[PDB]
UniProtKB/Swiss-Prot annotation:
Heterodimer of an alpha and a beta subunit. The ITGAL alpha subunit associates with the ITGB2 beta subunit. Interacts with THBD. Interacts with CD226. Leukocytes. It is found in: Cell membrane. The chain holds residues 153 to 336 of 1170 of the full protein. Integrin ITGAL/ITGB2 is a receptor for ICAM1, ICAM2, ICAM3 and ICAM4. Integrin ITGAL/ITGB2 is a receptor for F11R. Integrin ITGAL/ITGB2 is a receptor for the secreted form of ubiquitin-like protein ISG15; the interaction is mediated by ITGAL. Involved in a variety of immune phenomena including leukocyte-endothelial cell interaction, cytotoxic T-cell mediated killing, and antibody dependent killing by granulocytes and monocytes. Contributes to natural killer cell cytotoxicity. Involved in leukocyte adhesion and transmigration of leukocytes including T-cells and neutrophils. This is Integrin alpha-L. Belongs to the integrin alpha chain family. Residues 4-175 form the VWFA domain. The integrin I-domain (insert) is a VWFA domain. Integrins with I-domains do not undergo protease cleavage. The I-domain is necessary and sufficient for interaction with ICAM1 and F11R. The lineage of its organism: Eukaryota, Metazoa, Chordata, Craniata, Vertebrata. Glycans are attached at N36. It comes from the Eukaryota. In resting T-cells, up to 40% of surface ITGAL is constitutively phosphorylated. Phosphorylation causes conformational changes needed for ligand binding and is necessary for activation by some physiological agents.
């Protein structure tokens, strides 16, 4: 069937210009590889607040990944992960914004630090959630574990820990090995 995938990327002040850019290039490569398929995308940047850089309707009309993420401004603030997810589940996955009712909802969270807010993400339970933690802020095992509550289970499947942003390329190569033409 169809798949509606949302990219929820970290825009905190911790992120260096080049690192932020590498997070955007990664998203584009994923989109480019899965173009002309039954996939539709939307990207949301989060820091203290949130902003939908482009929604499903925008993707359908434009398609070009580079153009959809050309006017992104690095927020350089905090990391309110909880509120961001909630925002995605109640303000992004909507028919008014090109979301398809039949589509399988997917969310790919990309962050470089522990959340600075608290709460719960119950509003997104019905969403398949992946999370990538990057950088030295996830040096200890305890810091990495804090991301488990945002991703689906098991953690070994929905939680990826990258020690450097350069490893995003390794992730993209590992991700492609899972691409298949399946009809039945
Ligand atoms: C290759 C393993 O990579 C990771 C491991 C843990 C956390 C994040 C990542 S990156 C990661 C992992 C998976 C996906 C991805 C892309 C398209 N579809 C799916 N599924 C959702 C719908 N499912 C259905 C149809 O039931 C099948 C799988 C997933 C994208 C990323 N990413 O872009 O970033």
């Amino acid at each position: 069937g169809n798949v509606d995938l949302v990219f929820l990327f970290d825009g905190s002040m911790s992120l260096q210009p080049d690192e932020f850019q590498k997070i955007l290039d990664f998203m584009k490569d994923v989109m480019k590889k899965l173009s002309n398929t039954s996939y539709q995308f939307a990207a949301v940047q989060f820091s203290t607040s949130y902003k939908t850089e482009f929604d499903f309707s925008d993707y359908v009309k434009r398609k070009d990944p580079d153009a959809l993420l050309k006017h992104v401004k690095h927020m350089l603030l905090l990391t309110n992960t909880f509120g961001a997810i909630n925002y995605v589940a109640t303000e992004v996955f909507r028919e008014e914004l090109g979301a398809r009712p039949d589509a399988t909802k997917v969310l790919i969270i990309i962050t470089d630090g522990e959340a600075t807010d608290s709460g719960n993400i119950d509003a997104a339970k019905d969403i398949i959630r992946y999370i990538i933690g990057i950088g030295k802020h996830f040096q200890t095992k305890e810091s990495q574990e804090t991301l488990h509550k945002f991703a689906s289970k098991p953690a070994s499947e929905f939680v990826k820990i990258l020690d450097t942003f350069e490893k995003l390329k390794d992730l993209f190569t590992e991700l492609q090995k899972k691409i298949y033409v399946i009809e039945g």
